Every structure is written in structure tokens, then in C-alpha cells.
Amino acid sequence: MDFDVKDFGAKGDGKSDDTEAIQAAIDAAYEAGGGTVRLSAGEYRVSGGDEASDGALMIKSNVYMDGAGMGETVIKLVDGWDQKLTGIIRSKNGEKTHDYGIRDLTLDGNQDNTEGEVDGFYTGYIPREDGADYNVTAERVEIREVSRYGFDPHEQTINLTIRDSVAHNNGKDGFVGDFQIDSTFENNVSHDNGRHGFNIVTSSHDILLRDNVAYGNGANGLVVQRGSEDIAHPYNIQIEGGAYHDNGAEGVLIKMTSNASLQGAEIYGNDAAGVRVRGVDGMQLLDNDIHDNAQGGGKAEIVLEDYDDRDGVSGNYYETLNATVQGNRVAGAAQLLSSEGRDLLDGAAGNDLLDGGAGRDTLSGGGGADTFRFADRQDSFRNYEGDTSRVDDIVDFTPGADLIDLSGLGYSGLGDGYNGTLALLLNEDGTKTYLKDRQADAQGNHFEIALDGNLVDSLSATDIAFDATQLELLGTTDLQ
Numbered sequence: 001m002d003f004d005v006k007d008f009g010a011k012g013d014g015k016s017d018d019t020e021a022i023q024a025a026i027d028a029a030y031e032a033g034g035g036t037v038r039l040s041a042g043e044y045r046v047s048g049g050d051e052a053s054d055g056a057l058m059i060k061s062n063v064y065m066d067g068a069g070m071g072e073t074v075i076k077l078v079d080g081w082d083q084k085l086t087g088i089i090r091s092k093n094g095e096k097t098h099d100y101g102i103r104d105l106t107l108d109g110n111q112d113n114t115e116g117e118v119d120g121f122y123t124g125y126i127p128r129e130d131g132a133d134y135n136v137t138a139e140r141v142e143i144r145e146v147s148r149y150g151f152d153p154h155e156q157t158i159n160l161t162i163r164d165s166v167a168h169n170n171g172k173d174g175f176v177g178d179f180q181i182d183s184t185f186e187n188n189v190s191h192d193n194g195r196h197g198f199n200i201v202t203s204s205h206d207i208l209l210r211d212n213v214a215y216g217n218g219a220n221g222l223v224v225q226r227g228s229e230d231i232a233h234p235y236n237i238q239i240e241g242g243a244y245h246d247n248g249a250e251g252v253l254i255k256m257t258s259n260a261s262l263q264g265a266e267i268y269g270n271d272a273a274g275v276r277v278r279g280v281d282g283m284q285l286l287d288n289d290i291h292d293n294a295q296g297g298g299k300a301e302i303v304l305e306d307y308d309d310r311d312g313v314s315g316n317y318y319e320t321l322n323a324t325v326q327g328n329r330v331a332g333a334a335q336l337l338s339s340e341g342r343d344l345l346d347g348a349a350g351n352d353l354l355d356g357g358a359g360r361d362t363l364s365g366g367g368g369a370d371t372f373r374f375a376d377r378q379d380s381f382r383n384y385e386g387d388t389s390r391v392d393d394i395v396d397f398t399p400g401a402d403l404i405d406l407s408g409l410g411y412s413g414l415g416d417g418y419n420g421t422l423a424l425l426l427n428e429d430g431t432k433t434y435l436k437d438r439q440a441d442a443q444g445n446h447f448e449i450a451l452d453g454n455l456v457d458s459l460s461a462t463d464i465a466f467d468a469t470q471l472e473l474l475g476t477t478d479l480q
């Protein structure tokens, strides 16, 4: 059954406190078993409760609020409110609220004329307890001028959808997804917020972030992170399309997350790296357009690195693992470092640094002068049985342009492959060129690298750095 707020005494005049009248329509719609609460165009002033957890308006199960449009219907916090208010619209703490939503309206937190932390839209059940809100929809909603978090769906919410919405000029993050599950953020814009455009945090998993745009935020365009507590990391985070540009830090930052994907985005004009990946297990970075980042200083368009939390709350060291970096256009340097397991690392037009770490990795530099680093003799090797897997291959080594950094391995130079030298060998059919250590170590292992193609004639000693002195002289990058 459909309910109009004006029928409950709501004025929408910008001056009268309409909180009770709008909540009356909510409660009547909830008592009918569900329905739509409609708000014609106008500015409805609203106030909070006794506690921050009271929010301002309590949406209920099977209740949807439909305004007359963003800008047309504005729900604005009263002048002078001085109490922390957790959700101008919110579901009840300790209730699994379900099948509710808001559409075509503006939430205005009025931070210029209020004091206290205010969040726009708050969802969820109980922090650190099992249970969830579910089937939650925000469609064409604008949240602005809240002092902290604009869209703040919270622990836990399953099947939250926020689409075609905007968060701007909020004091902290425009969108936070806090322990969101099986949820969708699609075709949203988050801009000119105090800190992050989008912030996916607190164990959120199976999240689609499709065709979102974040610009002009004080910190990240999008950050996906564990957060500050020792809890399960987020995982299964798929970032598809959109644009993360002109933000105060990295365009996209992903850290302490498993199975994350960033594909087909445009990423530019950010003050820090365009993309930064710290301690991510399973990272796919495909077909993105990355340019003109590090505007605030910095040497890298793309940064892959570990996340050392040993001095932090978990006590753990988190490696970036299982990385696939292909198809990107990158107008600047990519630092692509990974660890145990098979990595596929493709640089682009910049002067890139590539290191797949342990395991059988396939590396390519693309354009420019690229350094392929092998930090450990066990990072590319063939074993006693002749198991040729675990041997890295470099797809496109360019003699006179690229560099093989062996400076930490203690080989003296090219030679016959014994006594600390490496042999340069062509395989039987002349399809691959090998650098080989013919001397087995105590475990029977042989350091070996495959260079795809025939380079036995074009490769020279000046294409390999065999010690730190040679690396300082020959290094192609500004990232070592």
C-alpha cells in the first residue's frame, strides 16, 4: 500500500521538523505489510534521536521511500544539531531488516550548520555478531554534506544494490561498504569527499563495483582493504570499468584482500600511483587505461608490493601472490613484483621493473627499457629430475634496451655455466634462449632463465647486471 508523507503532516518547507510525520508514514507502510512512502518535491527538515544509533529516520522491512528525484526531494538535517547521528536514514540495530530501499531523493547532512559525526545511509544488524540486513536498494540517491560517511551500509548486509547514485562533499568517505556480502555498486559517482570516493572494508566479499566513477576526493578514488582490526580479509572483489581520476592519493588501492580484479577502468590524474596493490592474494589487473598519475610526486603508475603487518594487529606478513597483469595501457613505470606461484606480469610503454619471485612466471616488458629482476637462485630453476617447470620465461627481451638484474645472485658473468658463470644456450629447435647455471646446488637445483626467441647472437654482457655496481650503471628504472 502506498503512503504520502504530506498525508501524515509532513510540510517539506525547509523549516518544520518533519521527522515524526515521515516516520509515521514509514510505520504505517510497515504495518500494512509493506509499501512505498512517497515524498513530493520539497526540502524536509529532520532531527535525530536520543542516541546516535537512533539515526534520524528508521526505515523498516518491506518499506521503500520514493522521492520526486535527486535535488527535487531533499531530506536535510536541522540546523544546530550537535549529536553524533549514525544514519539520516537507517535500519534498526539488532534487527535483520530486509527488502527495503530508497529512491530518487537527496540526503543533506547540513555539516556547515551542525556538529558531530553524521552518516547518510546506514544498514546492518550488529557489529561482530552473525546476522544481516538483506535485499537493500538505493537507486538514484544523492547524499551530500554529511560530516562523515555518505552511503554507509554496514555489518552485515547481503545483496545491497546501490546504483545510479551520487555521494559528494561529504567529510570522510562518499561510499563505505562495511561487511557487505553478495552486493553491487553500479554506475555511481563519488566526488569531492573529504577522504575516499569508495571504501570497501571489514570482510566484505563477492562485491561487484561496475562502471563507478570517483574524482576529486581527498584520498583514494577507491580503496579495498581489511581495515584496522585483525579480522577476515575482504575477498572476491570485482572492479569493472568506470574512471578513478584526480584524487588526492592513489586512484585505486587494494590491500590485504584475496581474489581482487580491476578491469577496463580509466585511471588518471591522481596524486599518487594510479593503481597500488599491497599484500593481495590473487590480483587481476587487465585492460586498464592508466596515465598521468603520481601528480603529487612518485615514480610509478602501478605499484605491486607486499603488506608487512608484523608490527600491526595481525602479526602477519602478507605477500602479493597469484598476479595477472595484462593488456594495460600504462604511460609510465609499472612496478610488478609477486611471490610464490605462477605470475603473468606484462609491463607497458614505461620503463618497468618485473619480478615474479618464486614459481614459474612469464614476464614481458612491452615498450621502453625494462628490468627483469631475479632476486634469488630459487626463483627460476630446473630440478634434479629435469623438471623444467619453475623456469621463468621472458617473452620480449630486447638486447640493448632491457636489462636482466641478477645483481643479488653472485654470478660473475657469462661463461660456460660453471664456476659462478652462466651459459647462454639456444635450445634444440632455436625457439628459446637459456641462461643456465650448469652447477647443481646441494638440492640438485639449477638456476635457469628462458628468453623466448633466438638471442644467442644479440645478447651481450651489457644486457645483464651481475653485481650491484653493474646494476647502478645499467639499471633502466627509477624504482630500485
Ligand SMILES: O=C(O)[C@H]1O[C@@H](O[C@H]2[C@H](O)[C@H](O)[C@H](O[C@H]3[C@H](O)[C@H](O)[C@H](O[C@H]4[C@H](O)[C@H](O)[C@H](O)O[C@@H]4C(=O)O)O[C@@H]3C(=O)O)O[C@@H]2C(=O)O)[C@@H](O)[C@@H](O)[C@@H]1O
Binding pocket: 051, 052, 053, 054, 086, 093, 126, 127, 178, 202, 227, 228, 229
Ligand atoms: O572505523 C572504525 O573506527 C570502526 O567503525 C566500526 O563501525 C561502528 C559504526 O560506525 C557504528 O558507530 C556502530 O554503532 C553501533 C554500536 O556499535 C552499538 O552496537 C550500538 O548498539 C546500541 C543499540 O543501537 C541500542 O541503542 C541499545 O540500546 O544499546 C546498544 C549499545 O550502545 O551498546 O548501536 C550503534 C549503531 O548501530 O549505530 O558501531 C560500529 C562498531 O564496530 O562498533 C567498525 O567498522 C569497525 O570495524 C571499525 O574499526
Ligand SMILES: [Ca+2]
Binding pocket: 091, 092, 093, 094, 095, 096, 097, 123, 124, 125, 133
Ligand atoms: Ca537492521
Ligand SMILES: [Ca+2]
Binding pocket: 111, 112, 113, 114, 115, 116
Ligand atoms: Ca560543522
Ligand SMILES: [Ca+2]
Binding pocket: 347, 348, 349, 350, 351, 352, 365, 366, 367, 368, 369, 370
Ligand atoms: Ca615497459
Ligand SMILES: [Ca+2]
Binding pocket: 338, 339, 340, 341, 342, 343, 356, 357, 358, 359, 360, 361
Ligand atoms: Ca611467482
Ligand SMILES: [Ca+2]
Binding pocket: 365, 366, 367, 368, 369, 370, 398, 401, 402
Ligand atoms: Ca621493453
Ligand SMILES: [Ca+2]
Binding pocket: 357, 358, 375, 376, 378, 379
Ligand atoms: Ca626468492
Ligand SMILES: [Ca+2]
Binding pocket: 356, 357, 358, 359, 360, 361, 379, 380, 392
Ligand atoms: Ca619465478
